[PDB]
Design a protein around this ligand. Structure first.
Ligand SMILES: OC[C@H]1O[C@@H](O[C@H]2[C@H](O)[C@H](O)[C@H](O[C@H]3[C@H](O)[C@H](O)[C@H](O)O[C@@H]3CO)O[C@@H]2CO)[C@@H](O)[C@@H](O)[C@@H]1O
Length: 158
């Protein structure tokens, strides 16, 4: 199922994302990641090393260290270096955009959703379901410009 819900403060975050280099596409991805477009979920989303998640998109460390200028070349053991993305939105957005530009959208979705294993199996039903969910959210956000600044959240239960 899918739907809408009003989240106070959401329009502020939408506008900060869109004024920090993010596009409507970035907004759709982040809207699926968290309810509040925030970074205050549990540290690393409770995961460690290559599986740890950082930033408003919950990017994993494998992706960050393999495909972003800010962390390129870094090791699995260096995973705590990704925590800076939890309070630097500009670098967070740039990292995701760079990562998608390195891998391309299809493989970026696979690695974002399933890590390094996803890169070798990028068209599973689960990755496709995630891609279809982001696309649906994007199309709802694109359907009225009010959704770029109001407190409306579009959600999908992936
Ligand atoms: O698996 C994708 C992504 O999901 C994040 O969790 C999202 C859920 O995907 C879903 O959108 C969820 O929506 C709630 C919604 O907030 C409302 O309360 C409604 O009544 O019930 C739905 C149940 O789906 O919201 C969460 C974010 O809070 C998150 O788990 C990511 O790690 C994950 O990659």
């Amino acid at each position: 199922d899918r739907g809408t819900e009003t989240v106070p403060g959401l329009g502020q975050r939408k506008q900060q994302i869109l004024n920090s280099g993010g596009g409507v596409w970035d907004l759709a991805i982040a809207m699926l990641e968290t309810k509040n477009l925030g970074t205050d979920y549990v540290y690393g989303d409770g995961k460690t090393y290559d599986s740890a998640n950082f930033g408003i998109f919950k990017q994993n460390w494998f992706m960050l260290r393999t495909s972003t200028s800010q962390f390129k070349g870094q090791t699995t053991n260096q995973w705590n270096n990704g925590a800076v993305l939890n309070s630097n939105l500009q670098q967070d957005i740039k990292a995701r955009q760079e990562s998608q530009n390195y891998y391309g959208p299809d493989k970026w979705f696979a690695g974002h959703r399933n890590g390094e294993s996803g890169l070798s199996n990028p068209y599973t039903q689960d990755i496709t379901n995630y891609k279809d969910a982001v696309n649906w959210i994007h199309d709802q956000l694109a359907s009225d410009p009010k959704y770029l600044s109001d407190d409306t959240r579009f959600w999908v239960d992936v």
